[PDB]
Structures are given as structure tokens and as C-alpha cells.
Design a protein around this ligand. Sequence first.
Ligand code: NAD
Ligand code: NAD
Ligand code: NAD
Ligand code: NAD
Lengths: 384, 398, 386, 384
Amino acid sequence: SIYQGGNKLNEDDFRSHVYSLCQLDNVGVLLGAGASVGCGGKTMKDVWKSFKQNYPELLGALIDKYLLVSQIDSDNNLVNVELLIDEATKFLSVAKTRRCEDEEEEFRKILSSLYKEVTKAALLTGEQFREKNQGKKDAFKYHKELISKLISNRQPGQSAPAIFTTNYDLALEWAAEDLGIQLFNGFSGLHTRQFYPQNFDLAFRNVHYHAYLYKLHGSTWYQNDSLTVNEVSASQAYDEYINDIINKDDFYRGQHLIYPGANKYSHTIGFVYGEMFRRFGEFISKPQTALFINGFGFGDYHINRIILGALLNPSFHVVIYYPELKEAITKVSKGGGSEAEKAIVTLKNMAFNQVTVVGGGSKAYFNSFVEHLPYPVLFPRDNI
Amino acid sequence: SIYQGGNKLNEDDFRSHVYSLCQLDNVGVLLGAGASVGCGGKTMKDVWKSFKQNYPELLGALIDKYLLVSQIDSDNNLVNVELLIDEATKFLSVAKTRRCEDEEEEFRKILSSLYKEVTKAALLTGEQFREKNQGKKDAFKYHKELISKLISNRQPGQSAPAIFTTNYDLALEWAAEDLGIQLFNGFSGLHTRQFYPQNFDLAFRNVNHYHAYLYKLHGSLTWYQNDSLTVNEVSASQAYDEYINDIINKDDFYRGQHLIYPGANKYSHTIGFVYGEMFRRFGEFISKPQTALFINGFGFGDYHINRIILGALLNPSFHVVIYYPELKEAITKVSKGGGSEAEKAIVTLKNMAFNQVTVVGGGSKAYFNSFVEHLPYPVLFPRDNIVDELVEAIANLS
Amino acid sequence: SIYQGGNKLNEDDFRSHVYSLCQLDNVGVLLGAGASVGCGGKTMKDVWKSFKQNYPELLGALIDKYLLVSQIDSDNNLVNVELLIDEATKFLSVAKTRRCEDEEEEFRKILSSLYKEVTKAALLTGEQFREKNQGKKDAFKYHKELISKLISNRQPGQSAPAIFTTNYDLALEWAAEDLGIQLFNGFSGLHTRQFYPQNFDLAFRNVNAHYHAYLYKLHGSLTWYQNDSLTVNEVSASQAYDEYINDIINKDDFYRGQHLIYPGANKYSHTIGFVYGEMFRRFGEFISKPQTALFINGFGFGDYHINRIILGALLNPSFHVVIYYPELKEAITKVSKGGGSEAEKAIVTLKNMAFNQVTVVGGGSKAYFNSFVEHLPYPVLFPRDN
Amino acid sequence: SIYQGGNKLNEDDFRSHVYSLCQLDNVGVLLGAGASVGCGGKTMKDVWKSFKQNYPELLGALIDKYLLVSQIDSDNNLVNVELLIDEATKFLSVAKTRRCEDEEEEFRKILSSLYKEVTKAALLTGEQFREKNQGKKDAFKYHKELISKLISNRQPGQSAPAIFTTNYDLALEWAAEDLGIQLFNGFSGLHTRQFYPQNFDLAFRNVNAHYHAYLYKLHGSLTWYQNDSLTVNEVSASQAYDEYINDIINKDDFYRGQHLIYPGANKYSHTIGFVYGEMFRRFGEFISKPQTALFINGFGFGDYHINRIILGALLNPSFHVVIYYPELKEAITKVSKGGGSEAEKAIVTLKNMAFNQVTVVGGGSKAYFNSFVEHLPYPVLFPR
Ligand SMILES: NC(=O)c1ccc[n+]([C@@H]2O[C@@H](COP(=O)([O-])OP(=O)(O)OC[C@H]3O[C@@H](n4cnc5c(N)ncnc54)[C@H](O)[C@H]3O)[C@H](O)[C@H]2O)c1
Ligand SMILES: NC(=O)c1ccc[n+]([C@@H]2O[C@@H](COP(=O)([O-])OP(=O)(O)OC[C@H]3O[C@@H](n4cnc5c(N)ncnc54)[C@H](O)[C@H]3O)[C@H](O)[C@H]2O)c1
Ligand SMILES: NC(=O)c1ccc[n+]([C@@H]2O[C@@H](COP(=O)([O-])OP(=O)(O)OC[C@H]3O[C@@H](n4cnc5c(N)ncnc54)[C@H](O)[C@H]3O)[C@H](O)[C@H]2O)c1
Ligand SMILES: NC(=O)c1ccc[n+]([C@@H]2O[C@@H](COP(=O)([O-])OP(=O)(O)OC[C@H]3O[C@@H](n4cnc5c(N)ncnc54)[C@H](O)[C@H]3O)[C@H](O)[C@H]2O)c1
């Protein structure tokens, strides 16, 4: 179920590709919601579902007094939320310009509920989230495996693999804490954690099991209107700030920075995206590379662009896994497609056999991703 | 006229500093409004005056209906266009959402007026702007030689320099064409030019090469869109022929998402992308080691730049030379409790006890004309014009 | 059906030959004008047919009043307009020295209408020509691929492949745009885009290790027109459709150096300019060199310059030529008794030549341009032991 | 004497400049009919006088009926011989197509007169043309010595000199062949000797360190001919004198059709277009390479295209041109009266140009073969 250069590839060639690939100089992984679904995570679609099923007042006000969606479109489960927050800032700044002190109520209620659904669907474990004994659960059956498999396909004098994802929650950090592996996601210390580029370039020397981490959703990173961000336990941050977001139902000020909103200029100085995409750009600009994606929602405009440039590195055999790939092709054939859907279907249909895309379906899940990677052989020896 | 922390600067120190800079990763120069008078463009003051003198009847909406502006800011011209135009677009979008007709029409006409006034001086040529081979006029002569000095100091194999501009003029294209150099600016192609930001990470090689990275900061006349939000660029002729003239002198004729300037459509990710990416490349450029940054003759009318510089002081390789014609007057004004944001910002910046702070109070000497006049030229340097004579002689043959 | 050096060869051996050639030092293709015929183009014979059908009564009157070309000659489709245009300039210069004013109009009609027809057939699109989003057309599905196989079959320390052709159109920058490929065309700048041979010494590379490709267009181009400024400029083509195409088509003015395209027998008519002087020079620098192979689409071979040099260039073993020629049995039977045209004799010249260095292919559908495109096997990736 | 940049120069500086100019990667010499005036040659004015005297009547038909030239224009001797010949042939083709026998014969007579005038005076050997070993004549001895000066000054391992001629006679080649020197002008063979362009991209090598060079012919030759093959079949002069040239030159009236190739006759067909267009072409390729100098001697700049090429080369900022005019003083005197043609206007304007890149060496006798030979030095090792 692998397509490259407009032609199919066989299982033996797939295995040879994998075996050759594991030993390349550099390897990296990015993934969307191909795994968080099993763990119980919530995506933007679930945010829309909850907003539909819990808020009739604001949704009805939008439907008629603003006319920002139709019933059929909402039923189709395709409405956007990040652009909705952008237009919410538009409306509310217009109100603060002309000072309409009634609309402010509804729009700030919408923002409160929205950012609530954003920063309150990242737990996956209820109020147990702040407790201890987290990584040990077996619900990470395959997750943990991945990290292990990617710290054995190595030889002395090689850099650690780089990892990317779209996870709001901290599932993979939980697996790391379980396995005792030395991850890295920007900060150092316990009492004080401050952003520093230099902290992203730390490597260990045995006198090893480790790996890297980089979240697109980013922020345990709290800013109490102090122009700075710091990190401490989920339990402390819970006892301190988000407790007030439990039984108050008040307005949401942008104290601590999390960025699901598309219009970056809504927060013109957002400074967590830059590092993640600097890392991604560095990862593109190298031969002997590999990127995997599996049911990665092609919904970001800035993620469908660097990849088209990335195709111009041949040994960058960019990989795709998408069980529901029929929708994009069907839309392209008749009536055109969306923006990122068109971008990815254009990525695939580049004459190179380097571009590799998987649309197998039931076999494209995270289970295939974990199982396909084999374990290393220390001494191949002479096989003749 | 030049002071370095109360000290005196001589020719030897300047020559040593220039020589040290010439062997650095990046070398560049910057010019402000004072030195950009000759380019032929117009500032925000001209646009605001023309708007308030050509559509006085619409001053009510900015205050009497939406509070977009005050009177003191308008009285002393303390309004930055980008904010007002952005608010106009916000009101237009909300009017579209709310099916409001009168406000829609008012904002459409206001946008038309501001566009008509702003677009005037961006051509740099006028009626003959559509004509190809625009470099025939001598106005661009000064643009050519200087560019050479920005790259002539680079030895073979050295990293190419960069050029930064404040306004949205397009003199660099014609200057490079006259000199015969190409610049990578996202756009690329012949028929369907599109914006490749990966284009930055490229280089040339010799089988058996100097260039520069071109950045368009505050918009552009040649910028546009094609019915798909995809960013395209085209030579000046088609832009001045098809759509620009209609906008200028077609009365009531405006549309939706077709033009990208100045910082206009940020509520749409597609446009914003361009400015965000250019700023990202700038910000990660200063993160380089052994890099030289220049802030020359700048009024510091922006807020993000100053805060970014303050937060980026961790780099021990920051050197700044700024021209400021009138300093005693501004010091007196701020001391009494007056002054604008720019004056306060520059005064605070200059109050750092460092030996890298240089202040120039030569007045008109800060202008481009005076700077050119003061400089000498080599005897053997080619300054005379011979292409015109050769072309005339060739045409004379029959 | 398939021959190499006067003997018969099988398809598998030809495929092995192609695979072995692909790894040599130099690669490049000479897409015959007929390659663009499928892209909406037309041949010189089609131009003759159009010029006959648009002026039927006038053509008949000219034929029966001066008999430059007999009606039977056109009926059999054995007319060479390439000679006709040189004939026309000859006649009209003779008259202009004779000053006959009445005769100074029919030849104007013939020449200007021929130029209009050539340019119109070279547009390839028509009214939609100026509309953008070209590359999305499915027709280029092969042409597109043709330019992606010349960057994957190369490694560090190798030259930049170049593309020869005999086409009016610009259908190489179209794929370039559609795939972001830099097919260096020898031009610099955009606002005033002028050709410069010095641009034939630039190649792309990856700083942290990029792709590139060259361009060699023999048959001029529509965009290449000069106003007696002895210069050629490259501005867009949609920009053109309103500029001069309709204008000249709907102005009815005397002909001049309207745009630099060459229908006519005299190739050195360009005795004043340089274009003609910078599209063979490197051709000769190419075909004669160690580890070289000039690809061709095989039909006709009806020139006095390129083929003349091509045959004589074979004196060194490294050069190889692979061509297709289905017309083997019929042509052999016709030429066995009697003689043939210059082109037919030139092409059958190599039948007597037994050099394995030359190749010929046939078999009808097996000898199409699609076979040429598919005969560019993918570069070795993840090699293993079989 | 010598004027560079509008100022005179001394002998020492000129000698130093000439000595330093010998660092060229490739060396070539350009010649023509200008240098043959002082050795007893004939000019175009003599040719026109001979034509008018032999067959004056013809001058009428072309001059008045066909308007091939004005009466005063003809009297001024401003008709290009090859162009008039070619357009007479074009008239003949017109007559063949449209069957106007009167003009056909009236033009056959004119063409026969033209070839009787040019071919008869071009053999330059009389009855010795049919003889062999024509290189033993002492009349060319001086010329032979000049060749030594061009080859004796080149160190071993350097490129041998090249010879360019603007006329279309083999007298210089006959003189040079007496020394057993080999020249590559794209010809080879004995019994069917032909014209081959690949010779321009091939050369010999020495394994015991002898003489080689390239010759270029532009305006035709005394031999170049044809026989129903569209080729260039060069053979020994005696074959030609015994085959068809005998029947043409001295006979009362005789002319054949598509048989002759000179002095640029049938440019209305491809046959010669490839020849000339591939012999002057390489001359341009000589100036393509950077840092190469060209010398002009015995050439009157009789073609506007040559001035066009010179000016186009001058457009680049790294090109230098040296101009030799045998009759500069006469040209200045003639144009001082307000007359002169387009070529005279162009050359006078170029001379008046005040640039340091213009060098003029013209004093009448100083531009002749004898003065040119005397000015040049002799080899130091040559016995004296
Ligand atoms: N922190 C930053 O600076 C930054 C910068 C850019 C983008 N982002 C975030 O990065 C972008 C990531 O895109 P996302 O929101 O779609 O990621 P997500 O994991 O939160 O959501 C899953 C996405 O994948 C699609 N999908 C559906 N089924 C799937 C499956 N079985 N497997 C995988 N995907 C499936 C969904 O349509 C889509 O929601 C978000 O738009 C945005 O929240 C963050
Ligand atoms: N990619 C980017 O760099 C980027 C990012 C965000 C916005 N923008 C653009 O920025 C938005 C608006 O920016 P702007 O026009 O307000 O900035 P600006 O052009 O006004 O900043 C420079 C100005 O300062 C003035 N000035 C006053 N005193 C001066 C002095 N003493 N010396 C020099 N100059 C002096 C000058 O007239 C003028 O050059 C546009 O909407 C948008 O196009 C660009
Ligand atoms: N300035 C320069 O660079 C320069 C120099 C020399 C010549 N030229 C020009 O170059 C010469 C090009 O010759 P031409 O264009 O007349 O050749 P052509 O188009 O007449 O011949 C090509 C051949 O391809 C055959 N064919 C039929 N079907 C085909 C198919 N499917 N694929 C491929 N071929 C098929 C056709 O029978 C035959 O026309 C012109 O004579 C001349 O105008 C230009
Ligand atoms: N170089 C090319 O590529 C090319 C191509 C086509 C035609 N041609 C023409 O082909 C040749 C045939 O024409 P041609 O019959 O006149 O032969 P040619 O070489 O003798 O032409 C030069 C003419 O200049 C005249 N002249 C006047 N003043 C002179 C002076 N001071 N010194 C020397 N000559 C002086 C000569 O009488 C005469 O020789 C011409 O030389 C040349 O114009 C050249």
C-alpha cells in the first residue's frame, strides 16, 4: 500500500527500505493523532463536538446574529476552531474599538469556553492527572516500544533521534519516566526553568538510552503576566493556577501561552512555534533522512509547505500514512480539494520515487508503525 | 560632529573598523527617511494629509462612529497607517459577517481613498513605470555603485551578504539588472512565479557566483494574488497595465482578496505567512555567530524591533551606529516632560555605558547627498557613462 | 525490428544498453519538433496545408500563373515551404530591385500570412493561452517525467544534463514552473530578461550535503523578438497574447523582424545576429567528447547542418546514438530500386554502416515517444545482492 | 604613424607592447586583398573597368531596365560583386520558373561576362594552372619566409599559428605548401577529396618532443565545384583545368548551371550557406575565449557585418581592437569634401572616437607587404 513515483512497491522492497533506513545518519519522527485516539485523547474535532453538545446559547448566537456557520456544515463536522478564535479576536477588538459592551459578553464567553476546551482536554486521565505513578501503566503497550526501538538502531558516534508530534498531553513523557530514558524538551532544572536556545543542544557522553522531544502544541509552561515562562510539576501548576478554572467559569486571559490559533498575529509575539519549526527546517536540510506521518491531519498551512521543498532532497523519502486517503483524491477529481489536502496530494504526485505515501487503510495505524521497525543485529558476521 | 561616548573618532579608527567588518560573515547598510528623500517615495504624512484633504467628510467614522482615531494624534500626526488600515479591514469583515450595508459602503470608499493616495509614489517612475528597461533614467545610478561596495568586499567563497529595506520600493531589482546579478526573493519562475521560502537554502558552484538575499519588508507594488491565495510576483509592466491604473483612476471599483500590502490581510494566514517568514529568517539570522548587524539613521518608530533587540542582548557581538540630527533639542523636550515614544526610546537606548555607542549630530550631513559628496573616488574607478554613447553610435549606423 | 550495427537485436538487449548508458558521464535529449506536435503543435507540412486552405483561390491563381509549385505536388504532400520562404525573399528582393509595385503585394501576402500561420500554430493554446495554471494539463504527464529523470540519475562529480529540441514553443519552462525545476535558459533578470551565454556555467548544490537542469533550444522561441535593438528579451507569454499576437494578426502591416523564428531554407539568414551562433557551438562541443551520447526522437532527419555534423562526429568510439525508425521495410524496398530524397538517403546511410555504436528501433507501437520516456529507468536505490 | 588614444607613441613602447602581446592562448592572423596591392595585384576598380571595356553593352540592361544600380552609383564603383552576381542568378531563376526567354538569354550573357571577368583573372598562373608542383615558384619566396616568422617564435608545446584570408584564392596556400606544411581547413582525400567540418574539433599530438595549423576559406576558391551531389569536391587544379574550366574561361561564350561554387554564387540554396556559415563562424568563436588578441592586416573592412561584430565585442568591458587602414589619409581627404559612403562614414566616425582602446597604424606604404615584413624583427638564432 506504498506509492512512489506513481508506481507501487512490494513488501520485500519495503523491508529493504526499512533496514537500509534504520542505519542512516539521521532519522526523525512526527505524528498527529494516529495514536492518541486509543489512549483517549481529544482533537479539534472533539473540541467541536463538545462545543456543539454543550453550548446552545453561543452557537445559536453565532448561527443567526453573526451567521458564521450553517447547520449542514456543522453537521458535516468540518468547522474550524483556530480560525474561529482568530475571528473571535477580530470581533472582540472591533468591539473594544467601538466599545459595544454587550457583544463583549458573548464573545468573551465564547473565548472562555474555547480556551477551556483547549487547556482542559489535555489530561486523558481525569483528576488523576496530578497524582503520581503515571508512566507505569501498560496502556502505552506500543508507545514505549517505539522509543526503545529507536535507541538501539545506533552505533557509536551518532546523534540521538529527534521526535515530533501533535500531542497536547504528556503521554510520551510518561512512557519516558517509566523507562528511565533521558528525554529533552527545552528546559533544565526543577525550581527554575527558563527558555534558552543553548539548552536544546545538550548531548550525553558515557564514562546510552536517551532521546529528544519537541511539541508543536508546546506549553506546564506557565506565564503569570510576567513576560516569562517556567516549568514545574503538573500537580503544582494544578494546585496553583488551573484550579481557578475549575469552578469559576470566568473569562480567559492569555496568561500562559498555548497556540492553537491559526492567526499567529492574534498573539504577534508567540515564541514557541519558532523553535519547533527551526528544528523541522534543520531536519529537512539534510540527505539520509526520514519523516513518518500517520493520519496526520493536513490542516496546518505551514506544515504543507516545507514538505514540498523537502521533496527536493531525494534521500528524504518523506513517508505518509493516511487510512482515509480516498477523500482527498475524490475531492481533487471532482470539485477540487482543500488547501493542505491539495498540497499533500501534490506532494505524492511528484515524479520522484523518493516520495512515499501509504493509503492502505486498516493497516496504516500506529500499530503498523511500531511493528514495522525491527530490532538491531549486533554482529551480522559473514553470511556466505 | 561624531561622538563615541564623549570621545573623539579619527580616520584611522574608522578605517580599522571598516576593515574588520569587511572580513565578517555579513556586511550591510541601512538608510532612513532622512537619507531616502531622493528615492522619490512619499511618507505616511503625505498620505494622511492627502486623505484628510480629499475626503474630509469621512473623518466622522474614525471618531464619531468607531473611535478609530483621536484628534491629538491626527493633529500632530501620531497615527501609524498599519493599525488604522487593519481596523478598517476588521470592520469590513464584520460588516460582511453581519450583513451591514451602510458601514460596508463607507469602509469600501475609505479603503479606496487610502489606496489611491498611498499608491501614488511607489512607482518611482510615474507614467513610464510600465515601460521595460526602467534603469535608463539616471535616478538609479547611485543605487548601482553602492551595491557593488556591499559585495565587492567579499572574497571568493565567502558567504553572501544581505540587504534590508524599510519602505516597499523596488530599486534593488533594477539596480541588480543593470549590474547583472540575481537575487532570491521567494518568487521564482517565468509565467507562474510563486513564493518558495525554501529558496533561501541554496547556493551555486563553479564546474570549471556572488549574490544576496532580497527581503521585501513593508509590502510591495508588484505583489498580488491570483484567485487562489497563492503569492505571485510579475515584472512592473503588467502590474502597471492591468489592475494598478484602475485602482488609481477608476472611481468606485474595489474587490476582495487580490492585493497584499501594506501588512493588510493578517486575519488570513496565507498572507501573514510571508511577513512571518521574512521576520523569522531575520530573527534566526541575528542568532548567527560572528555576524554584524547595522541600525543606521533609524527613528525607531517600531516596537517589536526594540524589544527583540533588548531580549537578544545575550549575543556579545552587537554593534550599533545611529545618526540622530537633533539631540540637544530632544533632550530639552524630554527633560521638561514632553517628547514622543521614539525620542524616549532612543534616549533610553543611548543611555547605556558602553564604548560601542556612537552619535552623529551633523544635521544635513546625515543626508545621502552630503555623504556622497564627502566621499572621494578613485582616479581609475569607472564613473563616466559610455553605454549611452555606444548605443547612439550603433543607432546612427544605417 | 530493432538493429544495432547492421544486425538484428532484441528489446531486452536494447533495455540493457539504455541502462548501461544511463550511468555514463554525459546525458541529454534532442526532442524532435514532433514531440511538441502532440502538445497542440503542428508541423511545417501542417503549416503548408493551412496556408493552402486559407487562400485556396489565391493559391490556385498563383500556381497557374507562375507555377512555383504544381497542384499535383501539393496533392501528394511533397512541398517544402522551407525552400518556399527563401524563394519568396528571393523573388521579392528581385522585384524590389526591379521596383515593380504591383508585384510587391502578392509576395507580401504570402510571406506575412506564412509568418502569421507559423506563429499561430506555435502558440499551442489559443484564447486560453494567456490563462495561467499551465502545467496542470494531463498531456505533459510524460514530458514532465522526462525532466525529473535527468536529476535522479546523476551523482556528485557529474555535469548538468542539457536538453536539445527543435520547437517553436517554450514547453520546457512550463514543466520547470510546474515542478519548481530550474531549467537554466541562459537569461538573467526578470524586469528586463536578456539572454547571456555566460549563464551556461552555473549549477545548484545543497549547502548542508540541490537539483538543477539546463536548456538548449535550437528553434528559437516566440517570446524572442527584437525591434532592431539587436537584443532579445524574455517577458511572459500571457503578457504577449494582447501585446503583439492579435495586434499583428489584426493590424495587417508590412513584415519586419517581427519575432525571431525561422521558417525557411536559409539557416544563416541570421547573418547579423548571434542566436544562431550560440546554439550549435556547444552542440559541437557536446557530440565530440569522451563518454557522450546524444538522444534523438527518430523521424525525417531533414537538415543540412546538424545531421551533416552528426554523421561525421561518429569517428570516436565513445559517442553513441540511439534512434527509432519504424519505416524500415517500406523504405528499404523503395530505395532498393531507384533513389530517394536527401533525408531518406541520409538516414539510410547508416544501414550500410555496421557500427554497433549506432542503433535503430521499430515495431510500430513499440517505437513511440512513450517508449523513449519509459526507457529512462530509475536510478539505483538501496542496491542489494541478487 | 601610430596613434593610440589620440596621441603618438615611440618605437620602444610599441615594441614592448607587441612583445608583451605574445602571451595569447591562441594566435591567428587575418589577411585579405589589402596586402596584395603592392605585389602587383588587381583591385575591384580594375575588375569593373575590365568588365565595362569587354562587354559595355550589358551595363545598360541592369543599370536602367532592372535598376540593379544607378548610373552615378555604378560610376562610383559601389556595387557588391557577389551580391550583383547572386541577384542576377535570382533573375535567371525567375526566368526559369516563369519562362521569359528574352531576359533569360540577356542574363546568361551577363553572367557569362561576369565569370569571364572574374575566373580568367583569378587563376594567376596562365598555362601553368594545369601544371603540377606549382609551389616551386620563387615569386612567393618572400611570403614563405613570413610563415617562418609566425612559427619560429613559438616555444615547443604551444599552439601553432592559424591563418585567415578574406579573399578566395589559393596562391598563399600554394606558396605555403612548398615547405611541406599541413593545414586543417576541413578537407581530406585524393580521388574524391571533400569538405569535412569535424576536422575543426580534432588535432595531432607529438610523441617525440611536428607542424600543424588551421586554414579558413570564406569567399570561395578557384576550385570549389560540384557534380549533381551538393558537396565541395576539391581536386588538383589540372583536373579542373581539363574538365570544365577550359570550356569557360578562354572560349567565346560558355556557361553551365549548378556547377560553380565561388565567390559566393548560390547563396540562394543551402549548399554554400553551410560552407561560409561554418568558416566565418569559428572566427567568432576565436573571440569568445577571454583574453585573446586579434591583428588586422591587408583588409579594407569591406563588410558592414565585420564592423558590427567588432562593435559587439567592444560592448564587453574586456575587449581590445587594433585597426589597420592602408588608405586612412586618402579616406580623410575624400570625406573632407563631404562625400563618402556608409562604410567610409562608419570608419571615419570610429577613428574620430576618443577612446584609449583604439589603435591606428596607417601611413600608406607602411601598410604594404614590404613595409610590414621590414618592420617585423628576425629570429635571434637565424643565421645572418
Ligand atoms: N505549538 C506551536 O507553535 C504550533 C505551530 C503550528 C501548529 N501547531 C498545532 O499544530 C497543528 C497540528 O495539526 P492537528 O491539530 O490536526 O493535530 P492533532 O493531533 O491535534 O489532530 C489530529 C489531526 O489529524 C486528523 N486525523 C484524523 N484521524 C486521524 C488519525 N487516525 N491519525 C492521525 N490523524 C488523524 C485530524 O483531522 C486532525 O485533527 C495544529 O493545527 C495546531 O494545533 C502548533
Ligand atoms: N516582514 C517584515 O519585516 C514586517 C513585519 C511586520 C509588519 N511589516 C509591515 O509593517 C507594517 C507597518 O510598518 P510601518 O510602515 O509602520 O514601519 P515604518 O516604515 O514607518 O518604519 C520606518 C519609518 O520611520 C520614519 N522615521 C521617522 N523618523 C525617522 C528617522 N529619524 N530616521 C529614519 N526614519 C524615520 C520613516 O519615515 C520611516 O522609514 C505594514 O503594514 C506591513 O507591511 C513588515
Ligand atoms: N537560431 C538557431 O538556433 C537555429 C539554427 C539552425 C536551425 N534552426 C532551425 O532549426 C531547424 C529545425 O528543423 P525543423 O523544425 O524544420 O524539423 P522538422 O519539424 O521539419 O522535422 C521533424 C520530424 O519529425 C517527424 N515526426 C512525425 N511525427 C513525429 C513524432 N510523433 N515525434 C517526433 N517526430 C515526428 C516529422 O515527420 C518531421 O517533421 C529549422 O530548419 C530551422 O528553422 C535554428
Ligand atoms: N567575412 C564574412 O563572413 C563574409 C560573409 C559574406 C560576404 N562577405 C563579403 O565577402 C567578400 C566578397 O566581397 P569582395 O568582392 O569585395 O572581396 P574583398 O575581400 O576584396 O572586399 C574588400 C573590398 O574592399 C576594397 N577596399 C577599399 N579600400 C580598401 C583598402 N584601403 N584596403 C583594402 N581594401 C579596400 C577593396 O577594393 C575590396 O577588396 C567581402 O570581402 C566581404 O565584404 C564576407
